[PDB]
Design a protein around this ligand. Sequence first.
Ligand SMILES: Nc1ncnc2c1ncn2[C@@H]1O[C@H](COP(=O)(O)OP(=O)(O)OP(O)(O)=S)[C@@H](O)[C@H]1O
Ligand SMILES: Nc1ncnc2c1ncn2[C@@H]1O[C@H](COP(=O)(O)OP(=O)(O)OP(O)(O)=S)[C@@H](O)[C@H]1O
Ligand SMILES: Nc1ncnc2c1ncn2[C@@H]1O[C@H](COP(=O)(O)OP(=O)(O)OP(O)(O)=S)[C@@H](O)[C@H]1O
Ligand SMILES: Nc1ncnc2c1ncn2[C@@H]1O[C@H](COP(=O)(O)OP(=O)(O)OP(O)(O)=S)[C@@H](O)[C@H]1O
Ligand SMILES: Nc1nc2c(ncn2[C@@H]2O[C@H](COP(=O)(O)OP(=O)(O)O)[C@@H](O)[C@H]2O)c(=O)[nH]1
Ligand SMILES: [Mg+2]
Ligand SMILES: [Mg+2]
Ligand SMILES: [Mg+2]
Ligand SMILES: [Mg+2]
Lengths: 98, 170, 335, 354, 315, 327
Amino acid sequence: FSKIKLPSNRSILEKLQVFDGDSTTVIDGFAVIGFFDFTSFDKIRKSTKIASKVLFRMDVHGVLSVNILSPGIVIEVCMLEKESIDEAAQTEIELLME
Amino acid sequence: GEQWYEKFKPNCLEQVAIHKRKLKDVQEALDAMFLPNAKHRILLLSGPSGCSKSTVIKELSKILVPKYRQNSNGTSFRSTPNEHKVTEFRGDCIVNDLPQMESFSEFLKGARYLVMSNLSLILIEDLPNVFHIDTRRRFQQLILQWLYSSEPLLPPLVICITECEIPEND
Amino acid sequence: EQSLAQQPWVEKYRPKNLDEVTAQDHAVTVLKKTLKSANLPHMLFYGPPGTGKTSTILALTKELYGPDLMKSRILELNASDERGISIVREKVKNFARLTVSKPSKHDLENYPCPPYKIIILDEADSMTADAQSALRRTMETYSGVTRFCLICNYVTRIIDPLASRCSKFRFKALDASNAIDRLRFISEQENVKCDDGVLERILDISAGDLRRGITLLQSASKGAQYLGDGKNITSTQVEELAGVVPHDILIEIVEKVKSGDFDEIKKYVNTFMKSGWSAASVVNQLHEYYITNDNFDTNFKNQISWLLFTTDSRLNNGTNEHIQLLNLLVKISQL
Amino acid sequence: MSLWVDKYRPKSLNALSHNEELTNFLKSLSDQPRDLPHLLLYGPNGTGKKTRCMALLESIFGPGVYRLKIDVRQFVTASNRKLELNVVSSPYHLEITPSDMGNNDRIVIQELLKEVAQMEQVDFQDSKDGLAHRYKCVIINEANSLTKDAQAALRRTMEKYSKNIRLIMVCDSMSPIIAPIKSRCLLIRCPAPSDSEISTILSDVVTNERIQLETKDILKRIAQASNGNLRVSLLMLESMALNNELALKSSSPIIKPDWIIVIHKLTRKIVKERSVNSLIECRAVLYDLLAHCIPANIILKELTFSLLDVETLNTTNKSSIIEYSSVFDERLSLGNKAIFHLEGFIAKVMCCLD
Amino acid sequence: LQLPWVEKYRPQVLSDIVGNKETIDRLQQIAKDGNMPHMIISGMPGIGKTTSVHCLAHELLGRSYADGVLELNASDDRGIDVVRNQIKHFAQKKLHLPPGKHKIVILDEADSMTAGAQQALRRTMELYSNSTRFAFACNQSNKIIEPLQSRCAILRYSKLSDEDVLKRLLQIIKLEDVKYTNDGLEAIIFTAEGDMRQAINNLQSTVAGHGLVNADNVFKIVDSPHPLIVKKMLLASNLEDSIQILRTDLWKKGYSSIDIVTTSFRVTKNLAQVKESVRLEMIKEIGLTHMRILEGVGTYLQLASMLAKIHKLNN
Amino acid sequence: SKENLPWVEKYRPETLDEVYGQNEVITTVRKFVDEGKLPHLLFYGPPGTGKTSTIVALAREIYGKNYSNMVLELNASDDRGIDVVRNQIKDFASTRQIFSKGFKLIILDEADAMTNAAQNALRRVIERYTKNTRFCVLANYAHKLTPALLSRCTRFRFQPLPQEAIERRIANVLVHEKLKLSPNAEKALIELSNGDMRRVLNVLQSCKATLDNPDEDEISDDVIYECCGAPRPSDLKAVLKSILEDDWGTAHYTLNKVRSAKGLALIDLIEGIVKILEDYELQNEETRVHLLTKLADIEYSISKGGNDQIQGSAVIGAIKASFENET
DNA sequence: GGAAGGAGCGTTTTTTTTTTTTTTT
Ligand SMILES: Nc1ncnc2c1ncn2[C@@H]1O[C@H](COP(=O)(O)OP(=O)(O)OP(O)(O)=S)[C@@H](O)[C@H]1O
Ligand SMILES: Nc1ncnc2c1ncn2[C@@H]1O[C@H](COP(=O)(O)OP(=O)(O)OP(O)(O)=S)[C@@H](O)[C@H]1O
Ligand SMILES: Nc1ncnc2c1ncn2[C@@H]1O[C@H](COP(=O)(O)OP(=O)(O)OP(O)(O)=S)[C@@H](O)[C@H]1O
Ligand SMILES: Nc1ncnc2c1ncn2[C@@H]1O[C@H](COP(=O)(O)OP(=O)(O)OP(O)(O)=S)[C@@H](O)[C@H]1O
Ligand SMILES: Nc1nc2c(ncn2[C@@H]2O[C@H](COP(=O)(O)OP(=O)(O)O)[C@@H](O)[C@H]2O)c(=O)[nH]1
Ligand SMILES: [Mg+2]
Ligand SMILES: [Mg+2]
Ligand SMILES: [Mg+2]
Ligand SMILES: [Mg+2]
């Protein structure tokens, strides 16, 4: 298990918000975790190569949308997440993040 | 936790479960192989699973290697006498700067140096992936090159092959 | 005129339109009215050699689309093409999924141009069972834009699911009763002068195959033209060309069989095989001679019918003609 | 020099000396070769079928059809098993024997022949205006030995590209030819020469070679020993003439193929002894015969008729022998390894005799 | 939603597995002791091999199950590279476990493993046996190469008896509160042919269709095993009886000719009553009919002729 | 669009209510979906009995009109090797539903064409992801399915279509078209169908074509036989009577005349004669043995071609010799 | 001076289509 953490600065991570699954109410202290197969997640690498900005949006139904902006070429990638996270993976993720 | 076949493994050549005549033949052949100019360079043991091929080879090496190794001229890796009587090829080893098919080729290229004050018995039990056609062809080439080598000095090379049928697979 | 005379008569007189197809009206009517209904189903043509299956499908395709549109709406594959499972799963499927090409104004004006393509699998009985299985859902799914036509001589070689999917058309054998008009027309076109009943004899010899009959007529016409005597072709010449054994030789064989002496039969058969007669023709002639004879009893006829069937089945397996013929004659002599 | 089989081979239809009716039919075919159909010549081996085909081609094109050369064509299977085929060619025709490819013969039909059929042969006209077109002639030797798949592949190639190609197939028996292929062909029966015509040809060869012949009867005997195979007749005539200082006599032995003598010895052994050990020795002889690439079905024919030639055997024995021969011939046709069926035949004969 | 009963009622402890009482008891002894050796578990489908191995691993490893078990089956990559890297790294891992406890590598459907991977497994077993133990699960123990078998204890699971199947069915019925009759449970057990998975599936199907598990209701959905019908057809003393069975019970029920002939061969192989000559002749006739069917002539007439020949031989 | 389709496809059932003949299976599956407890399914049966139609209709009912978004359908026309099972099927079965619409459905049509290795790999995919996904396997030949796969599926047998269901579907088609079918024609169609709806629909379409004016012309048994080129029952009866009573010459002439009248093929005559003789009351059983063996041999020989006249004479002789036992 | 037990012998190896693994890429 390895981790890549994005800095909490307004230069790489412009903004982050957690909406409690309704897009409206902001909740602090709640962690949203999305589990994906790298075979599908890695398909956005080439789109990110030319990307200027990337907007991630995850819903409660297990759908992740990535909007990539490079007058210009615009890309939208939608992927489904896995059904559930195994106990070992959940424990390792919690240990890594805490 | 200990398995009995490991806990009660033979501690000497006499305790090895092997027919006397076969043991005598193997011992004579191996002893001849250790002589300065030995006619035979490779000893190929074949048989079914668990018939004491590797065990008898190791027990015999424990006696033969000390008796035929030249005393080091005050040179050795570590303080200990480097009890490495048997050098075995490891088929699952993967290194960064070597293609898989060449791994065995590298091993032999080192094994040739284990003579005289560095004498050691070369044992091949875990073979390379001979089910791959190219790997098998390269293995055969290397064996032939060892057999036809012009090197004046080489260490004894023992190949233990356990014969078994391959069940039909989908 | 030389260019028109560059083709054997079978290719020269291949039907151009569905009207030219003879003796197969039971299916030709359905195919013809499909031109107006535009409701063509998947088809399975099956029948013995030289009955007009390939000609019928080619005429239908020509009538439906026309010389130009056809090239974009037809995919033809036969035994001369590789037709493995991968081919069925890639090339046939891709063609079946292809969008229907846009017809030109001329095509629409002149031809019905139904909104689907056609995949013809000639000699379909040569395809493997797995390759055939790969066609099932391809035919079912893309039936809106694609229709399949399978053609074969041995229907049992088509797997049951495909036979169920396809509407079946049996092509009947062409004999002296239903195909005589076409052969007479061909003879009149080529100015072949033959004695009365010659065309009947050709059609009876051909045994359901009009292609063989047309080839025989061409050979007889060539012989007559080379002779250049101006005389009518005779049935004896036709029988000689067809390889039919002369009646006197058959009578000699029958007398030898009646005698029953093994050595004499062996000697006569050894001398008879010198001439190179085909054992199949001899067996057919012996069946005709014995089954229709009124001088033998019922048990004899039953036994000889089974013997003849066994010998013919063995010959169909590409067996060795001398041995089979001698065995058959020895068995008959023992009846 | 060349063997007498090829040295005195006729090179035109007018040079044919036996089966006059066949020559007349071939000449009638050559009258207007513009619409020549596909041909299938069938008859006993060594009678002159290939010679007649070459004479027909010479009549259509000219003597240049005899200026033959050889090329090697490479094919690759789906398993990457590279292999080669010999293609004989004259400026007007091609000759192939796909059966030499075994089960791969179909590939030859699917790749080579089709391509030849697809490439339309055109040439600049020497005097007239525009290109001139001419169909290609292709000879398929040993047609009866083709697999059913190759025969099926031949069908639409023969039909569709009839303008560019005309096939002339040659076989010794039509039993293995599938019905569609026969339907697509003009069948030509080629009878074997009679003993008198074989003797006449041999006498002409003898006179040309200046070999002293005591009596013509010898030639007749040679004919009777060839069983109508003219090629074999000429080969034995040459062998006997060379072995007797170019002087044949009534006492001069007739030289037969060695495997034929071996089969005769095997027949005598089978007749004399019928036991398990005899069967094992018969197996040894059969394997020796097979090691020389003698076809299994040919061995079965020759053994069967050699056995039927035995004088001591009675009618029941011969009837049983021919029954077993037919059964095991079918088994060989439908089988994979011929040794099983040859052994079964010999064992059944031993049982019936004993 | 609601899980199918086959997965809903999968035993979670070794004490809930029925049948093979001796083997299950030995597994319980191993679980309580700890000294688990390399083992191979062989048997027919749906008798509890996978459940037994999973339950034993859980009981042995307790909370350490997540970090102490490596499970791989035919649905995962299991080539030689996997043995070289993943299994090797797992076996090299140093995990602190209670005394007598080792890491477990579960190789379900081990029979399908490739020859190269199996040969590679020898060295890892030799090197890491002090900390890792291997549990193979398969249907044919002979499909594991002999050098691997030489290191493992063999355990063959037998077919479940009607008593064990009935006991488990009664437990499931009590949990689900299902209405039934003795004849219905008898029919379910008879149609299961010793497969507990099939018994549970058929019980669930019958309950969903009608709720009350009777004989008639069970037989409306479930069909009697066609091997028994084929055996009855083959053993009929009259040609007409065999033909009638073939027509009514097999042909008109939609059974394909190929299935009928394959089942006939399988059944004839196990006919204890018949003599050897008759048996081998019947096998020959079945093979000839199978050859005819494979060529495309899969007609009822061919099967009737096969039956006629078999009857002729019986006389 | 649907008007241009072949009838076998134009009349494909859309809802489960349109599937006839399989009352038990339809009842059970409908109740399962009503309770939402669908297990892994196996549909085993002969061609053209409604398996694919039933599974598609069930998917439509479960997911409404948007079933194509959460159903993964694969058939023999698609490659389904072990790699496909490991990657595509595995990823589909291991991912969430589009809108949390319960479980996902994977249809493996014609699964008897899948390799043993792929079927073996399917076992644990089916088992582990049962909570989120359900599998449906359709087949005509069970011997091609591994025992492990068969153990995992709830089995449903599609019987050959009964006469009543075929009659109801024929009535529906006749109403949809402007067609008139006679009772004798319906009986002939049912007899020749052998429980396959596809054959019924194809023959009906061909019969509609045969009619000169379908708006007013009625289909009779003669039209059915003309379209199928099949023998009439009277022809079979006459041939059998001549074989069993007339002498060899008369029987040969009768067979030749009957065949030449409408160009009948020998195989269909043999099949009809076998149907007739199956109901014959024979006092000697050896007669049945001879009949069955000889006629099966003749059918096998015909399957490879051969000489037609010799085969017909063989049929005559075989029947005569077999019935000499009853003497 | 009877077996009882044991070892050694009795051997060589492409091919149709189709699917799959492995290694280098
Ligand atoms: N008296 C003994 N004699 C031989 N091996 C013994 C003995 N006692 C315990 N063992 C163990 O049994 C095993 C013997 O098997 P092996 O020597 O490996 O036979 P093998 O011929 O090399 O078969 P493979 O190729 O390893 S499966 C060794 O692990 C030994 O430690
Ligand atoms: N019904 C027919 N009407 C007119 N000519 C026919 C007919 N059938 C065959 N022929 C003639 O014989 C030739 C071959 O006809 P085909 O349509 O190729 O027969 P076929 O049934 O396709 O033969 P197979 O099955 O490939 S052996 C045609 O070019 C025609 O000259
Ligand atoms: N002995 C058993 N006791 C209770 N339930 C069983 C038993 N055997 C099978 N089952 C039931 O059927 C389901 C499958 O059991 P499994 O252990 O997977 O059978 P299996 O022998 O491993 O089948 P294979 O070899 O993987 S096809 C379990 O979840 C149980 O619900
Ligand atoms: N029970 C049925 N009710 C109504 N029509 C049916 C029925 N079964 C088959 N058909 C008709 O025949 C056509 C084919 O039905 P299918 O469901 O595809 O048969 P099938 O059992 O799946 O055939 P196989 O096993 O794939 S060859 C349908 O479009 C329907 O028009
Ligand atoms: N003088 C003469 N020789 C012939 C004649 N026909 C064939 N031959 C010769 O006899 C041999 C016949 O063998 P071949 O042509 O291969 O016949 P095939 O095997 O049936 O094709 C050849 O060497 C010919 O040269 C003929 O009509 N006259
Ligand atoms: Mg060892
Ligand atoms: Mg054709
Ligand atoms: Mg399991
Ligand atoms: Mg279907």
